Specification:
Shape of chain E: globular
Chains: A alpha+beta, B alpha/beta, E alpha+beta
Oligomer: part of a larger assembly
Number of helices of chain A: 5
Number of strands of chain A: 8
Largest sheet of chain A: 4 strands, antiparallel
Bound molecules: manganese (II) ion, zinc ion
Catalytic activity (chain A): acetone + hydrogencarbonate + 2 ATP + 3 H2O = acetoacetate + 2 AMP + 4 phosphate + 4 H(+)
Strand content of chain A: 15-25%
Protein name (chain A): Acetone carboxylase gamma subunit
Order of helices and strands of chain A: HHHEEEEEHEEEH
Strand order of the largest sheet of chain A: 1-2-3-4
Shape of chain A: globular
Helix content of chain A: 10-25%
Structural class of chain E: alpha+beta
EC number (chain A): 6.4.1.6
Number of strands of chain E: 23
Largest interface: A-E, 80 and 94 residues
Strand order of the largest sheet of chain E: 2-1-5-4-3-6-7
Enzyme class (chain A): ligase
Keywords (chain A): ATP-binding, Ligase, Nucleotide-binding
Chain lengths: 166, 485, 49, 96, 763, 246
């Protein structure tokens, strides 16, 4: 239903309130995903197809030649195969002292790092912060999302699955 | 339309933030069931007074008038100088619990008044205790800000009219319709009481008309040059909300429950540059009707211009033919602006605007009724915009109203409800009578004595103002009442 | 009753026990006498036997 | 707890008198016809009758398409609707 | 002996039939078709429209009876209409978590044969708040009225009010002090409290003297009763006007409609797959100012709530809380009903706002809550008065999980990084300005900030997870019910979580004790740990701290014209009030949970309501937004550069503007610093693994894992696999040195006589 | 409408009349002479000897129902018989301080119009331990049964047991830990807990989960109920044998 430029504004954080309320209060537009993902595609500097957005600067992607599925930054860096935790192949900054917590919180409003830690996760090439965790000491890294990509495209969207190698 | 005046505010120091925090509430005021829970729907409007035009004085008065922190008058002088320097256009003062003890808030007001005199500037001051001496500070401050923001421009109007009329030989004082459906005097400085005076005019005429003809359940529908006003008369009465909201603002004045949507005969027809969709309003053309009137200087087409294209309006009978309305002006401006950017004929250009409005008004009227728990078949629909009889078919089609009535005097229907309004004066005095259940008949007569006194003190007030209006006590019918809990 | 410290002797209504409903008679006999020894409302079957 | 006291004061005033006209035939007078206008609704043009509001009589009926005009009110009855006037100068929209 | 339900069946037979059909068929009550809705759709919505308006209006009207501002102004009350089996048809808004809690009491009565004794009769009145049957906390009190028609039960009405206090050890409603049920306040288990529409004198006299704020409680009772009876009358008028046939069809077709509604919205808004997320909060009971009587309760601990969220191709979904930690000696435990209705209120706020709000979505969700976890205790000594501590820290994770599916699919308008910790709860007791025994409990934490979006900043001072219609209430009204005066109300700067879109900021309130006698106060929120996490970037909101000043010498300071503390505590790391109070005993620390503490007139208490987490990498935020945050008071200027890479210069007007070249270059430099200061996760992991093997962590970190492994073996298996730990490494809870009472031995309510409890959860 | 006491007067009118006589006269109820005792001293002592034996023997029997040794072996239980106005006539030995506590509970009901609401009906059962009305401590729980004759109240039976615990903060009966009423344990203010001789399920479930030593508490209820009902039955047999006048 929605105008294409209006779903762009929504991505750019610039959409008007009337259409923002319209989008929220009425049944969703079945066409959203295919318009959305195409909007993201034309904003990448690499022509490999996008399969699913993982964050603002993070995607599951289909290699134009090998047809493998991978996690990719917007800049270009492939982290891992899509069934793996990308964070395992990323770089991490751990805020575990009052000095580091007091860089992003005023004292007293910072968590205490013997109870809670800030783990920031960056792309190796561009330094982009794709995710920040707030667990305890010892706590494993978290595999956020394992999507059923086949069922989504095939059963919920009525679309062929993109070609896939291993 | 938030087109008021650049108004500033002085409140208690340390609490300057409360206006713009909107008591949280105002991020969901007037929300349908579904959006009250749909969290991502909540949204704050701009504050009436921004943070850089708020200031704070150091004073504190507790819930019974005791001055815990006495007013440090210096902080009031800097407060005044700050907003005078900021070129504020009016200054509002709201100090906590001033309704109970206004000493400190009226000293602040005097100090501010002093500083504006020295500045030479024309800045009026509004003490909340002088206007709305009632609890709940977000309600009181919003209402008082209204006197500065929006009331002040039309403050001239009631004295220009009343002067023009006594000059011309009237022997009465005008009354104004007020938010609770009753009339007040034109002299009152609380013009915000008279803010929904026009719409309430219509609701009262429809109420009156119903009483004569036995219609007890009436849905009122008014379409003017700018908006579409809608209320329900449920079993002979209107509903009056005590501490209501209106335009997503908490207010301290009792209000008649109504609703509207911002479309009317003069609402402007524009196309989104990117969507190329039609957006009606929200602004209107007003007494300038649109392009169809040659001398109006209006360049954007209005719904009234579609009326001419489609044959709804008679070009030679606007105001009885006292006003020249040219159809070909409407046709050329509809083509250039709407029809050709949309690849449609001027007929289909105009008909699609009217069709959208028809459905938009219809779905609103259906939904305000659904929302209040009623079926449209439980009601009779009075329609009386002055431009509403042009779309009675539209917003009523298939709703299932028991009957749909266009009275012949539809065009002045509010002015009909105003001439129909009771000549009534009301007077109030608060009290502190506390009784247990088990009480001896002496504490019981003492209580009845003090209430008996207040009615007599009030009774002489009603009669004394009716004397100044040329009415002896014999003509006044009196009805005492009281507030209990 | 299950948590108690004292018991009641009861003359068996059956010669021979055995089968389900017979255990039902033995509880029933008990209850009955407990009503006599004490008071009908003294009975607390919900504690078990 | 008695929290306040109130006093109301009414004086009589001429309220506007609602007409109570005798109702007559459903056929409106030839005097009330003021010609037609080109009227466009659902992709269709029709010659819609024009009626002088004041020249209508209690009991008349007006089948759409027609517009009812006076000095300052325009009452639209498209094709597919109908109106009749009662003794109180009220009209009634029917679906029809 | 005819049963009392409209059929002739008993309450128990009637519900047992309906749950069997539901189990066998997969549709509520077996309804494979919705006769009324499909065949008489006009009549179906007219009933819906007229009844849902009735309950909305009942809540709004009746709340004008209460003295407490919690009910009168904030609206912490709810009205729900139920069918015979205790399933909701419709509800007013407000604290709608009690849709399910009152539904479970109705079911507990059904399952324990209240029908035989004490009997469900027309005009009867039931009152209940028992947490062991699934209520949130004793301070939320239910009134339940059966509805009869032509001599048979056709449904129930429930009304809930949040009451100021229920006479726990702690003075307040979220009280600390007590550590078990015994002391956790006046506990009512489905009591018959009236007959023939009239209350029992022995209930009135007993109930009113078990609490402090008696007049407030008394009026909170009338607000419930009046609402129940407005709704009972509404139904009778609706049935008499449209017929029992239609009403009876509607009373059950509505509930399958709500299940159908959840399924369809999942399929249109979501992505099938698996979502993993976790949440924590602190319980610092070791500290000196948590004075609890039982020595076995003085240890620090952390609530651990992992959620495996499974979304299926058929549109059902599953929430598995394997790995979760144990209940404890505090007042933060919950109940399987508490927890699952909490998750339902969240889906009313994103998934189904525009569908039927009733138990339908409940029947369309799968819940696995291991027995013995805090969310499903197996002990009848457990305490509840502040369940929200844990509850609101678990549900916030699920916003994030559910938000990844909107984001991948393109419904960015619906992404939300999660709820604020709905906290600090200003509480205290003593003699008030009317010289009556009294207790306090500010609902200012109804207006915390909310999670940022993928589209725009979170709302500041706006909502709570348990009621999206935020209200902070007027200063002038609160001062009628507490013996305190406001010295400030202020947006709480840098409370919002940073990001591309900033989370909503909390706000702050500075109070002076005034006209109080023999008065105490305490604090109750999260301190050491932020419950919410940011999303796709995005940092947690600020955590909590305490500020109290005793012996301020403020009578003299006010009178002599000296500086006095006003507004908020703008930079707690560089405070301004402390310098002003050279004689005071100032408590300024992280201990966000305390017990009762003597206060006196002119002492100071800072009320702090939390912020919400943010979205995206902060140095993607638009710089102008950062500058506006600085002027608007939302972010302290210090972190403009340090967090967002935004360089700001103050103009002649004194306001901040953007230095654009500086801001670009600072962002360029931050990216290199991030490269330089991070390490491959391989590298970090072998470091943390060494700390684990060495058991290098505070006792509260080691207790969270020890207890969690024991309740959730699949979680221990996963930890051991992840860190590659030998089977020689073992973490027995008994080796940590801290008390471990209730870790092996426990006794459930269901082990008491005649108790039949209802199970709603996989367990 | 007509009061429930054997006279036709209400409980309140009945006691108010009797306390006024006592105030004006200096003798309980105005009795300047003792009709029965002076005129039929044989009948007077025969009633005395048979009724005091009844309460002694009721206490002794029913204490074999309890699991708690406090009641079963130590005998910290008491049974008292009262007139309509709540004055004791006779008691078993044991914890006889509750002669006065249960009397003050009976009188609290009289003064607060329990008769109008919740009503004192035959076969009803009251449970109470409220210390603000004059009970020693929450752990001493009263059962109070009215006794009726030909449709009118002629007196009450009270039974007391010391219970192991009532769910205070402290585990025990003489508990420390709590410092106010709030936390001092399950406090029952003259609750109607049964009718037609049967306990109410909502009282059963609620009360048993407010304490620790549940099985003990349950059986302490049955020891109380049984003694009351042995004593109610006793009186009726005494009255049926000797006459309501005597
Ligand atoms: Mn609550
Ligand atoms: Mn004792
Ligand atoms: Zn990169």
């Amino acid at each position: 239903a929605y105008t294409r430029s209006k779903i762009v504004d929504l991505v750019d954080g610039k959409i008007d309130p009337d259409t923002l309320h319209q989008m929220l209060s009425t049944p969703k537009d079945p066409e959203r995903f295919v318009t959305y993902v195409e909007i993201l595609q034309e904003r990448m500097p690499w022509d490999d197809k996008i399969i699913l957005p993982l964050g603002p600067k993070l995607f599951i992607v289909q290699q134009k030649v090998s047809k493998k599925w991978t996690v990719r930054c917007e800049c270009g860096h492939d982290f891992c195969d899509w069934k793996d935790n990308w964070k395992l192949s990323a770089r991490v900054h751990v805020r575990d002292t009052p000095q580091k917590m007091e860089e992003i919180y005023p004292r007293l409003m910072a968590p205490t790092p013997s109870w809670q830690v800030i783990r920031e996760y960056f792309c190796p090439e561009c330094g982009t912060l794709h995710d920040v965790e707030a667990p305890t000491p010892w706590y494993p890294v978290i595999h956020d999302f394992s999507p059923d990509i086949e069922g989504f495209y095939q059963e919920w969207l009525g679309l062929p699955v993109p070609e896939r190698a291993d | 339309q938030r087109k008021g005046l650049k108004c500033g505010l002085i409140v208690n120091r340390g609490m300057e933030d409360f206006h713009r925090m909107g008591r949280a509430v105002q991020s969901h005021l007037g929300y349908a069931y579904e959006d009250r829970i749909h969290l991502n729907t909540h949204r704050y409007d701009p504050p009436l007074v921004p943070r850089h035009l708020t200031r704070g004085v150091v004073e504190r008065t507790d819930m019974i008038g005791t001055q815990v922190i006495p007013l440090r008058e210096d902080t009031a002088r800097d407060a005044a100088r700050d907003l005078i320097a900021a070129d504020a256009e009016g200054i509002v003062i709201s100090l906590l619990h001033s309704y109970k003890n206004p000493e400190n808030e009226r000293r602040v007001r005097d100090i501010v008044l002093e500083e504006v005199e020295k500045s030479g500037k024309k800045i009026p001051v509004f003490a909340s205790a002088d206007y709305y001496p009632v609890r709940k500070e977000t309600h009181r401050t919003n209402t008082t800000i209204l006197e500065g923001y929006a009331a002040e421009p039309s403050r001239q109007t009631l004295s220009k009219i009343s002067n023009a009329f006594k000059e011309r030989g009237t022997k009465f004082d005008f009354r104004v319709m007020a938010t609770h459906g009753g009339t007040i005097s034109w002299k009152a400085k609380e013009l915000a009481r008279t803010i929904v005076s026009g719409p309430i005019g219509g609701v009262i005429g429809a109420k009156y008309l119903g009483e004569v003809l036995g219609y007890k359940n009436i849905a009122c529908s008014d379409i003017g040059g700018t908006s579409f006003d809608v209320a329900l008369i449920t079993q002979g009465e209107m509903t009056i909300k005590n501490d209501p909201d209106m335009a997503r603002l908490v207010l301290s004045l009792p209000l008649v429950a109504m609703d509207s949507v911002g479309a009317g005969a003069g609402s402007f027809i524009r196309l989104d540059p990117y969507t190329r969709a039609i957006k009606l309003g929200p602004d209107s053309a007003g007494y300038r009707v649109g392009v169809c009137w040659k001398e109006s200087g209006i360049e954007t087409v209005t719904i009234s211009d579609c009326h001419m294209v489609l044959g709804y309006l008679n070009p030679d009978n606007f105001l009885g033919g006292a006003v020249k309305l040219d159809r070909q002006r409407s046709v050329d401006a509809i083509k250039a602006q709407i029809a050709d950017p949309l690849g449609l004929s001027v007929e289909d250009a105009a008909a699609g605007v009217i069709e959208l409005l028809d459905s938009d008004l219809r779905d609103y009227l259906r939904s305000m009724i659904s929302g209040k728990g009623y079926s449209p078949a439980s009601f009779v629909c009075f329609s009386y915009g002055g431009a509403g009889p042009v779309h009675t078919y539209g917003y009523t089609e298939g709703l299932g109203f028991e009957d749909v009535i266009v009275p012949a005097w539809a065009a002045g229907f509010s002015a009909f409800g105003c001439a129909a309004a009771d000549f009534e004066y009301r007077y109030d005095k608060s009290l502190d009578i506390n009784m247990p259940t088990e009480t001896p008949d002496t504490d019981k007569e003492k209580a009845a004595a003090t209430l008996q006194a207040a009615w007599e003190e009030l009774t002489k007030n009603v009669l004394e103002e009716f004397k100044l209006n040329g009415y002896s006590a014999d003509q006044v019918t009196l009805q005492p009442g009281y507030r209990m809990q | 009753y299950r948590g108690q410290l004292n018991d009641l002797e009861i003359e068996s209504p059956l010669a021979q026990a055995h089968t389900a409903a017979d255990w039902d008679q033995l509880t029933d006999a008990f209850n009955a006498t407990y009503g006599r020894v004490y008071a009908a409302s003294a009975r607390s079957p919900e504690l078990g036997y | 707890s008695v929290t306040g006291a109130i006093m109301r004061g009414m004086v009589p005033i001429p309220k506007p008198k609602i007409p109570k006209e005798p109702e007559e035939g459903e056929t409106p007078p030839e005097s009330a016809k003021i010609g037609t206008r080109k009227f466009y609704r659902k992709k269709r043009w029709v010659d819609a009758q024009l009626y002088h509001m004041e020249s209508l009589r209690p009991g008349n009926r007006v089948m759409g398409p027609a517009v009812i005009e006076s000095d300052a009110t325009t009452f639209v009855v498209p094709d597919g609707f109908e109106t009749w006037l009662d003794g109180h100068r009220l009209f009634h929209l029917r679906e029809v | 002996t005819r049963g009392i339900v409209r059929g002739g069946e008993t309450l128990k037979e009637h519900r047992d039939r309906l749950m069997a059909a539901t189990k066998a068929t997969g549709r509520y009550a077996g309804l494979k078709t919705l006769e009324l809705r499909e065949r008489e759709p006009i009549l179906y919505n007219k009933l819906f429209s007229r009844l849902r308006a009735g309950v909305v209006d009942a809540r709004e009207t009746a709340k004008k009876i209460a003295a407490s501002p919690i009910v009168e102004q904030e609206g912490e009350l709810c009205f729900t209409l139920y069918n015979a089996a205790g399933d909701s048809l419709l509800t007013s808004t407000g604290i709608i978590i009690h849709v399910g809690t009152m539904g479970a009491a109705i079911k507990y009565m059904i399952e324990n044969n209240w029908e035989a004794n004490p009997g469900v009769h027309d005009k009867d009145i039931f009152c209940n708040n028992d947490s062991l049957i699934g209520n949130v906390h004793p301070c939320d009190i239910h009134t339940i009225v059966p509805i009869f028609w032509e001599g048979e039960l056709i449904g129930w009405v429930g009304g809930v009010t949040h009451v100021i206090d229920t006479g726990a050890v702690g003075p307040g409603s979220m009280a600390t002090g007590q550590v078990q049920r015994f002391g956790d306040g006046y506990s009512i288990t489905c009591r018959k409290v009236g007959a023939n529409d009239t209350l029992f004198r022995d209930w009135l006299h007993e109930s009113q003297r078990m609490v402090r704020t008696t007049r407030y409680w008394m009026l909170d009772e009338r607000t419930r009763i009046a609402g129940c009876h407005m709704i009972r009358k509404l139904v009778e008028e609706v049935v008499a006007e449209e017929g029992i046939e239609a009403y009876w069809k509607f009373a059950y077709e509505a509930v399958e409609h709500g299940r159908l509604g959840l399924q369809a919205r999942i399929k249109a808004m979501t992505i099938p797959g698996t979502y993993r997320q976790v949440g924590f909060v602190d319980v610092p009971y070791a500290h000196e100012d948590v004075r609890v009587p039982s020595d076995f309760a003085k240890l620090d601990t952390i609530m651990h709530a992992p959620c495996e969220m499974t979304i299926r191709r058929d549109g059902t979904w599953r929430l598995d809380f394997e790995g979760s930690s144990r209940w404890g000696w505090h007042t933060y435990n919950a109940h399987q009903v508490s927890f699952t209705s909490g998750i339902w209120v969240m889906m009313t706020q994103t998934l189904i706002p525009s569908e039927m709000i009733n138990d339908g979505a409940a029947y369309g969700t799968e819940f696995r809550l291991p027995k013995g976890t805090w969310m499903n205790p197996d002990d009848r000594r457990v305490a509840f008065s502040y369940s929200w501590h844990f509850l609101v820290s678990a549900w916030t994770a699920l916003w994030r999980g559910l938000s990844r599916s909107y984001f991948g699919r393109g419904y960015l308008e619906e992404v939300n990084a999660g709820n604020a910790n709905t906290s600090n709860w200003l509480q205290g007791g003593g003699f008030n300005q009317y010289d009556e025994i009294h207790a306090v409990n500010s609902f200012e934490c109804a207006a915390n900030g909310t999670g940022a979006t993928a589209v725009q900043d979170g709302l500041s001072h706006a909502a709570a997870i348990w009621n999206p219609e935020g209200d902070m209430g007027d200063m002038e009204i609160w001062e009628l019910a507490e013996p305190l005066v406001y010295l400030g109300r202020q947006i709480k700067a840098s409370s919002g979580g940073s990001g591309k879109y900033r989370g909503g900021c909390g706000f702050e309130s500075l109070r002076m004790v005034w006209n109080a006698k023999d008065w105490t106060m305490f604090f109750m929120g999260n301190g050491h740990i932020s419950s919410d996490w940011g999303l796709m970037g995005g940092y947690p909101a600020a955590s909590g701290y305490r500020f109290a000043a005793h012996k301020t010498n403020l009578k003299e300071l006010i009178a002599s014209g000296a500086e006095i503390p006003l507004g908020g505590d703008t930079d707690p790391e560089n405070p301004t009030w402390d310098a002003m109070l050279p004689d005071a005993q100032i408590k300024r620390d992280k201990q966000a949970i305390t017990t009762e503490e003597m206060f006196s007139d002119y002492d100071l208490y800072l009320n702090y309501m939390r912020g919400g987490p943010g979205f995206g990498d902060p140095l993607d935020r638009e710089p102008q937004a950062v500058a506006d945050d600085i002027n608007g008071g939302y972010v302290l200027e210090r972190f403009a550069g340090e967090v967002y890479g935004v360089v700001v210069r103050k103009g002649a007007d004194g306001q901040y503007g953007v230095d654009e070249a500086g801001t670009a270059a600072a962002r360029a430099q931050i990216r290199k610093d991030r490269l330089a200061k991070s390490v491959p996760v391989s590298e970090w992991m072998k470091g943390e693994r060494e700390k684990i093997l060495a058991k290098d962590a505070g006792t509260q970190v080691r207790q969270m894992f020890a207890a969690s492994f024991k309740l959730g073996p699949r979680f221990e298996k996963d930890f051991r696999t992840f860190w590659s730990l030998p089977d020689s490494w073992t973490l027995p809870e008994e080796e940590i040195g801290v008390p471990t009472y209730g870790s092996r031995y426990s006794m459930d309510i269901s082990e008491l006589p005649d108790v039949h409890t209802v199970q709603f959860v996989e367990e």
